[PDB]
Amino acid sequence: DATVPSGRPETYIWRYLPAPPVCIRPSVMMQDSPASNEDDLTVKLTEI
Amino acid sequence: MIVPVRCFSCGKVVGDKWESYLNLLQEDELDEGTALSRLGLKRYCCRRMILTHVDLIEKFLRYNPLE
Amino acid sequence: DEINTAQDKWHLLPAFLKVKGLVKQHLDSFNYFVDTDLKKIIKANQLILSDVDPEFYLKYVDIRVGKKSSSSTKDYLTPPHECRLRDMTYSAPIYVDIEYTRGRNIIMHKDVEIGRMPIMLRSNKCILYDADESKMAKLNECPLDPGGYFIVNGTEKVILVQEQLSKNRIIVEADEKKGIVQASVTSSTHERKSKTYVITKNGKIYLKHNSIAEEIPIAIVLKACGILSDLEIMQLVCGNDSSYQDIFAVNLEESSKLDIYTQQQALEYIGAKVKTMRRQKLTILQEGIEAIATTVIAHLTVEALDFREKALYIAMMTRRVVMAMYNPKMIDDRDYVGNKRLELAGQLISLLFEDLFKKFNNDFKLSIDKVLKKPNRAMEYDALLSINVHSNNITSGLNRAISTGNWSLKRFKMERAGVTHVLSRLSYISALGMMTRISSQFEKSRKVSGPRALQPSQFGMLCTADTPEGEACGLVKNLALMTHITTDDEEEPIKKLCYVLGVEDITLIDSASLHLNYGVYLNGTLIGSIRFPTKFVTQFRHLRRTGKVSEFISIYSNSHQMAVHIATDGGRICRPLIIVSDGQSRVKDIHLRKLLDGELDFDDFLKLGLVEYLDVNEENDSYIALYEKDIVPSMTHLEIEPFTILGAVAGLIPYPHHNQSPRNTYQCAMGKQAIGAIAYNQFKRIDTLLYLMTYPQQPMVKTKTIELIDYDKLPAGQNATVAVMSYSGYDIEDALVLNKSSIDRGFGRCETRRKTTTVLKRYANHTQDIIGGMRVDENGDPIWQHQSLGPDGLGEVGMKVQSGQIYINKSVPTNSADAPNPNNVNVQTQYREAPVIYRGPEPSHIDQVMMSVSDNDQALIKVLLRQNRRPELGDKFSSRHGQKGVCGIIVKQEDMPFNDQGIVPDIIMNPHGFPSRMTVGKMIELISGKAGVLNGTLEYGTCFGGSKLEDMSKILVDQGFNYSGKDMLYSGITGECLQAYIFFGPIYYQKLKHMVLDKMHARARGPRAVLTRQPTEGRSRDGGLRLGEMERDCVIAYGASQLLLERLMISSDAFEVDVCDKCGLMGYSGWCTTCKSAENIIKMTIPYAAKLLFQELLSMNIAPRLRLEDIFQQ
Amino acid sequence: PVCKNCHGTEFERDLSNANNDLVCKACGVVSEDNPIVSELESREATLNNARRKLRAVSYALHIPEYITDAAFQWYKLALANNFVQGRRSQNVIASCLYVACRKEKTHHMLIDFSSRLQVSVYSIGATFLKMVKKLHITELPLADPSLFIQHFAEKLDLADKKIKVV
Amino acid sequence: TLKYICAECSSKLSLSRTDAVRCKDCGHRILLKARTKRLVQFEAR
RNA sequence: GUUGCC
Ligand SMILES: [Zn+2]
Ligand SMILES: [Zn+2]
Ligand SMILES: [Zn+2]
Ligand SMILES: [Zn+2]
């Protein structure tokens, strides 16, 4: 429907994508080494 | 490990009767039931304390750190 | 000493276990690996070659593990107990000899190191093989250790005896809604795992395969195998005068549909629709690729020219697919024991040795030609100096292959995980029960309770009273006491031998009478087509009884079909039985008297012809006999001993033939968690968490099982006085009351031992780790945290610790990741502290502290903690027949009953168990229990027999006690008699695990997780409980609407959110940050798990727009 | 780090009551409760190849691995000083590893590196001198010959009384 | 004092700090701390 | 994160 700014049907495919705040993807340190083993979700957003 | 110092059930001492019970076996070859009756374990609950006691200490001491 | 064969057959059962022990399957496979099986592998990957510079060749002449060929000393080796506390691998190096072209000429070189194999204890390549407790006393290892387990880099492990469905044979399958198939999985020993299937779509027989692009019907693939006359097709599969002609004749006209009619045209119908794996040469002939497509299929048989023996092997496979469509009674199950193949340790690590060894000599080949691609570097170069760089790939492959139980194979591309486990040193028999167990395959039949159930073809093969419950209730099984696993022998001599016994060849007989006659199946293939088998099969046994052929052969001969079977494949289960020829056995007690004199062991009995092994198939033809007083003149194979159906970990149950059948399985899960003793060297070892017990007792009523494995010589549990009665209400169901006095005299004082370890690490910039300590204050070094540091930093041995009070002081540098500046400027004070604190709810001691060095030189610190405790209430006592109990209350000594002589009963059970649980064995344990120590002799309560009851009552009544054990008592509370009598005496009670002080837990306001801010799971993670989803369903039926909100927002996960009104999505401290006005802000509170949904759901392109009303003015 | 009323600087983590809080000894105001525990491409390629080469020769020489990673730091900064270009890759790692052998003061003498590559000793020591001048190693321990005795005796197949002979 | 003892040599050696980890009078590489002389208190129950 | 057990 109309009467909202986002109601046009072109927004249902990607043109801009948001990046989630980093509390959702915490940089966990496994404490076996002084390098941080980063979770799965950053490197998916990094490679794109 | 070594023989317990008292009976579990009644409460008398069995610490002088362990090596004496062995001494009734190498010499004076005898039935083990009638041996302790000569030694004087009259009650029932004292008989089980020395019949079933595995003497584990005569195998631990051969593993000594002082050769 | 007048002996007979009536009851003294038992005295040969220990002769079977003396020379052939309890770890039979684990050691005798690894001993077959190291001696014979390694030469058969270098002979299959020899002569690595380089195409550049073609006159260079490295070939392997032999391979040895252990001793050299120069010095010819026994071995130079670290002892295993010296190895198991330094986190190293007990290994001996592998030596080969090689010859090659150095240059001007070829030279041979001896004793090259390539790797370091681990050796399991009590295998003959270790030091501990054939020791007489004098060398073993120097090596401080227990004589009673079972052996058969790796100790790879510290913690000790063992691989399990895994099994799968029988490869290289056939089954049948029956399905209602899908049509019926029959599987035939086969495995050539190189790079192939191929399985074939025969499907009946809508009334027509078909054939598919995982290398053909689509389905190819059945009349083609038999005309391609030579049988073309199209009357012989019906003549093989159907026979004559039956209904099989009416079902099968539909298939014959599809030959007329495709117009083939001959053996030439039959092949290229396949290769027209074969799926082409590209060999990158691909000179495909359109006649040659079909002959190989009729060669890489059903890899039991391969052919030279004639195709003929492969042809009717398909015809016998398609006979059973029309026998099943006639009636569904002909179906077989895929969990029958005859369709199971146990396969053991050393012939299973041999597969992993392939994929490493071929990975050795190809990267080593890739290092050769990288050097030989030089013009000047061609004349005097030697290749042996770059073998040490590729050497340890075998070692580091093998060590993680035992550590992490997952095997990355390549020639099968298969990923079996969970192949090893860490062995339980909690009890003695727990270290032996896990040595004999079987892990299944889990092919995702979780709905089918077929293999969850237990089949009757199991009597004496493997144990029936032992199986865990819960996560696996029928998929973990255990070997029986008398049990041997077969092994392959050979197959071409017996095929030559059966021809001699009067059988013909398949290439002479027409199929007009093979259905009239019988047929021998050697590993499932028809080779002889014999008639009159009962003359034939009895002449075959009589050669085996004299021992011309190997004894692991079975002559299963069924009659539902017209066939007989031969098996020689090895890896199947069997037990031995004594031969009974006629109405008299071949026992011959004059032989049995000569055994107790000692000159002939068990091995001589199978040489003369008095005993032979029987597998699960040969049980079906035989008519085995229980006892010698039940011989029929048509009756063979007397039972060697009837109580051999229970494994070595269920055998400690006394009189298991009286109690109920489920109340033996509930003890097999808990006998393996019994506190007791471990080994003779148990105060020496430094392992993770051991429970030790102060004053053990051997049990009162023994079994013939437990004197085979020396359970009495280091037992678990005491035998206290039990007077079964209700008392004081604290024993309602299976609780139990024991005095304050007898535990004070030393009844069941357990002892807990714990390891902790650190490693002093050397960093990049050459900075160590230091053990400095003992800071001072106000004339005194010892602070409240420093009463047990010692002068060396290692906390000194002998005194107690509490919460706080560190005991290994550890300091690490701060520049752990900086670049090394090549100078000496500022390294004087850089150590930040990081000690190790002792937590815990109870003060403990430290038992002994050692330090040593690891494989590569780093200092080790290993201190062992120690604490003991008195058995207060809450702890879990047991009864060895499956009657658990929490200690209800501890009362003083004067309150219990007391007999005429003054005996106070130790532990009181209420009588509310024996009717429901039907545990009559405990009631028979006590009658034999009271009589033994009064007579002064231990008594034998075995399985399927033992000390009888009627002669056991007489010795009780000769002393003055009751004839049924039921003595009278007085009351300790009030002084007079009891209106009823009390069943009375000693019962063997072992203490169990799961004591209460390491399960008491409480968390007020503790840690929160980093992602969702809830409390954190795990006791060592400082806990916090999960209020689940049906517990959310449990509250809602009460109609409660306030404590449900506080326990899901306020007490757990409260969070403060300021949110906007218009265009309603969240904002931070004082904004909206999408309409940057910061005016319409309304404060609320929501759970953190509701905020975090409202952000990651906004990360994809859907928006939770919030809308807000006020509460008031409804 | 600084309290809110008395401005103390020392905070003591009490761990007896499963709270693991933060509080000073002076007044007793908590700081924070509810703790939050956490449960060029060719430039990268040319050292990844150089990693395996240091991984290679450390295996054959029985080097304990805490020298290999330390020796990687020497090669990494000597990469920046334009020393590796032109010279042999199989040579320059041998001189690089040998420096970290003598900072650690091990038994490994230089010619054992020269043996398996089958080259002259004096070639490997030539680039060792031409390196050690360029990146200015000043401090460096002396090759004490006392190290070499107690390593020789193990391979010298002598009697059981191997401690009195050293 | 009465410092570290060997595993089977049972020879009292006091290692000076950051020097060695082995023992003398034997080629063995495991050292155990000898038990302290300070008075320790116990109950009798 | 993955397994073992009650
Ligand atoms: Zn007594
Ligand atoms: Zn807004
Ligand atoms: Zn303050
Ligand atoms: Zn020593």
Short mmCIF file of N, CA, C and O in Angstrom, two decimals, chain C residues 362-406:
data_model
loop_
_atom_site.label_atom_id
_atom_site.label_comp_id
_atom_site.label_asym_id
_atom_site.label_seq_id
_atom_site.Cartn_x
_atom_site.Cartn_y
_atom_site.Cartn_z
N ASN C 362 54.96 -38.76 -1.85
CA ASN C 362 54.67 -37.93 -3.01
C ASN C 362 55.11 -36.48 -2.83
O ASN C 362 55.59 -35.87 -3.79
N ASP C 363 54.96 -35.92 -1.63
CA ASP C 363 55.58 -34.63 -1.35
C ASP C 363 57.09 -34.77 -1.23
O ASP C 363 57.83 -33.81 -1.52
N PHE C 364 57.57 -35.94 -0.81
CA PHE C 364 58.99 -36.24 -0.90
C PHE C 364 59.44 -36.35 -2.36
O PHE C 364 60.55 -35.94 -2.71
N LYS C 365 58.58 -36.90 -3.22
CA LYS C 365 58.86 -36.88 -4.65
C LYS C 365 58.81 -35.46 -5.21
O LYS C 365 59.60 -35.11 -6.10
N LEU C 366 57.91 -34.62 -4.69
CA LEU C 366 57.82 -33.25 -5.18
C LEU C 366 59.01 -32.42 -4.72
O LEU C 366 59.32 -31.40 -5.35
N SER C 367 59.70 -32.84 -3.66
CA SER C 367 60.94 -32.18 -3.25
C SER C 367 62.14 -32.65 -4.06
O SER C 367 63.16 -31.95 -4.09
N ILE C 368 62.04 -33.80 -4.72
CA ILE C 368 63.16 -34.32 -5.50
C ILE C 368 63.32 -33.53 -6.80
O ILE C 368 64.38 -32.97 -7.08
N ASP C 369 62.25 -33.48 -7.60
CA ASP C 369 62.35 -32.86 -8.92
C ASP C 369 62.50 -31.35 -8.84
O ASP C 369 62.97 -30.74 -9.80
N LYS C 370 62.12 -30.74 -7.71
CA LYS C 370 62.42 -29.33 -7.50
C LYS C 370 63.92 -29.10 -7.35
O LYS C 370 64.42 -28.02 -7.69
N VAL C 371 64.65 -30.09 -6.84
CA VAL C 371 66.10 -30.00 -6.80
C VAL C 371 66.71 -30.40 -8.15
O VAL C 371 67.64 -29.74 -8.64
N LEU C 372 66.18 -31.45 -8.77
CA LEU C 372 66.75 -31.98 -10.00
C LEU C 372 66.42 -31.14 -11.23
O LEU C 372 66.81 -31.53 -12.34
N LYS C 373 65.73 -30.02 -11.07
CA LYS C 373 65.55 -29.08 -12.18
C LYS C 373 66.64 -28.01 -12.17
O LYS C 373 66.39 -26.81 -12.27
N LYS C 374 67.89 -28.47 -12.07
CA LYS C 374 69.07 -27.62 -12.09
C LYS C 374 70.13 -28.27 -12.96
O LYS C 374 70.33 -29.50 -12.89
N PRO C 375 70.82 -27.49 -13.80
CA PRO C 375 71.82 -28.11 -14.69
C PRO C 375 73.08 -28.53 -13.96
O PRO C 375 73.58 -29.64 -14.19
N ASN C 376 73.61 -27.68 -13.09
CA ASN C 376 74.82 -28.03 -12.35
C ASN C 376 74.55 -29.07 -11.27
O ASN C 376 75.43 -29.87 -10.94
N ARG C 377 73.34 -29.07 -10.71
CA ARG C 377 72.99 -29.96 -9.60
C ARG C 377 72.46 -31.28 -10.17
O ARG C 377 71.27 -31.60 -10.11
N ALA C 378 73.38 -32.06 -10.74
CA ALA C 378 73.00 -33.32 -11.36
C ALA C 378 73.96 -34.48 -11.14
O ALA C 378 73.58 -35.62 -11.44
N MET C 379 75.17 -34.27 -10.62
CA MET C 379 76.21 -35.30 -10.66
C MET C 379 76.43 -35.97 -9.31
O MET C 379 76.31 -37.20 -9.21
N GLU C 380 76.75 -35.20 -8.27
CA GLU C 380 77.10 -35.77 -6.98
C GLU C 380 76.03 -35.49 -5.92
O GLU C 380 76.29 -35.63 -4.72
N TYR C 381 74.83 -35.11 -6.35
CA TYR C 381 73.75 -34.84 -5.41
C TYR C 381 73.29 -36.13 -4.73
O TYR C 381 73.19 -37.18 -5.37
N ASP C 382 73.00 -36.03 -3.44
CA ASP C 382 72.35 -37.10 -2.68
C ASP C 382 70.96 -36.64 -2.28
O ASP C 382 70.76 -35.48 -1.91
N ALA C 383 69.99 -37.56 -2.33
CA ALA C 383 68.61 -37.22 -2.02
C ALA C 383 68.21 -37.52 -0.58
O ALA C 383 67.11 -37.13 -0.17
N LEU C 384 69.06 -38.19 0.20
CA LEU C 384 68.61 -38.66 1.50
C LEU C 384 68.60 -37.56 2.55
O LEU C 384 68.00 -37.74 3.61
N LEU C 385 69.25 -36.42 2.28
CA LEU C 385 69.41 -35.40 3.30
C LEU C 385 68.13 -34.59 3.52
O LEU C 385 68.01 -33.91 4.54
N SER C 386 67.19 -34.65 2.58
CA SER C 386 65.88 -34.02 2.71
C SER C 386 64.77 -35.04 2.97
O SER C 386 63.65 -34.87 2.50
N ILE C 387 65.07 -36.10 3.72
CA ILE C 387 64.01 -37.00 4.16
C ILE C 387 63.52 -36.65 5.56
O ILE C 387 62.40 -37.04 5.93
N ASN C 388 64.30 -35.91 6.35
CA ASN C 388 63.91 -35.58 7.71
C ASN C 388 62.84 -34.50 7.75
O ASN C 388 62.10 -34.42 8.74
N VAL C 389 62.74 -33.68 6.70
CA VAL C 389 61.70 -32.67 6.62
C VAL C 389 60.33 -33.30 6.40
O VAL C 389 59.31 -32.77 6.87
N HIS C 390 60.27 -34.43 5.71
CA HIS C 390 59.02 -35.14 5.50
C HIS C 390 58.80 -36.26 6.50
O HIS C 390 57.81 -36.99 6.39
N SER C 391 59.69 -36.41 7.49
CA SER C 391 59.64 -37.58 8.36
C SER C 391 58.44 -37.49 9.30
O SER C 391 57.69 -38.46 9.46
N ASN C 392 58.25 -36.34 9.94
CA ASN C 392 57.31 -36.24 11.04
C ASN C 392 55.86 -36.08 10.58
O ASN C 392 54.97 -35.99 11.43
N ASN C 393 55.61 -36.05 9.27
CA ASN C 393 54.23 -36.03 8.79
C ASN C 393 53.50 -37.30 9.17
O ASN C 393 52.29 -37.28 9.40
N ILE C 394 54.22 -38.43 9.23
CA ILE C 394 53.63 -39.67 9.72
C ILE C 394 53.33 -39.56 11.21
O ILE C 394 52.28 -40.00 11.68
N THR C 395 54.25 -38.95 11.97
CA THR C 395 54.08 -38.88 13.42
C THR C 395 52.94 -37.95 13.80
O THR C 395 52.02 -38.34 14.52
N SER C 396 52.98 -36.71 13.30
CA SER C 396 51.95 -35.75 13.69
C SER C 396 50.59 -36.08 13.09
O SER C 396 49.57 -35.62 13.60
N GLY C 397 50.56 -36.88 12.02
CA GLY C 397 49.30 -37.41 11.54
C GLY C 397 48.72 -38.44 12.49
O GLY C 397 47.52 -38.42 12.80
N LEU C 398 49.56 -39.35 12.98
CA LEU C 398 49.09 -40.43 13.83
C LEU C 398 48.69 -39.93 15.21
O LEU C 398 47.74 -40.44 15.82
N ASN C 399 49.41 -38.92 15.73
CA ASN C 399 49.16 -38.49 17.11
C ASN C 399 47.83 -37.75 17.23
O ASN C 399 47.10 -37.95 18.21
N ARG C 400 47.49 -36.90 16.26
CA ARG C 400 46.17 -36.29 16.29
C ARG C 400 45.08 -37.27 15.88
O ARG C 400 43.91 -37.04 16.18
N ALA C 401 45.45 -38.36 15.20
CA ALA C 401 44.49 -39.38 14.81
C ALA C 401 44.02 -40.22 15.99
O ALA C 401 43.00 -40.89 15.90
N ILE C 402 44.76 -40.18 17.10
CA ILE C 402 44.36 -40.84 18.34
C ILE C 402 43.83 -39.81 19.33
O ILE C 402 42.92 -40.11 20.12
N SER C 403 44.38 -38.60 19.29
CA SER C 403 43.94 -37.56 20.22
C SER C 403 42.52 -37.12 19.89
O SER C 403 41.60 -37.31 20.70
N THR C 404 42.32 -36.53 18.72
CA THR C 404 40.99 -36.13 18.27
C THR C 404 40.39 -37.28 17.46
O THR C 404 40.90 -37.63 16.39
N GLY C 405 39.33 -37.89 17.98
CA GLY C 405 38.83 -39.12 17.41
C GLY C 405 38.06 -38.96 16.12
O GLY C 405 36.88 -39.29 16.05
N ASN C 406 38.72 -38.44 15.08
CA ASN C 406 38.11 -38.31 13.76
C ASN C 406 39.16 -38.55 12.69
O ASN C 406 40.27 -38.01 12.78
#
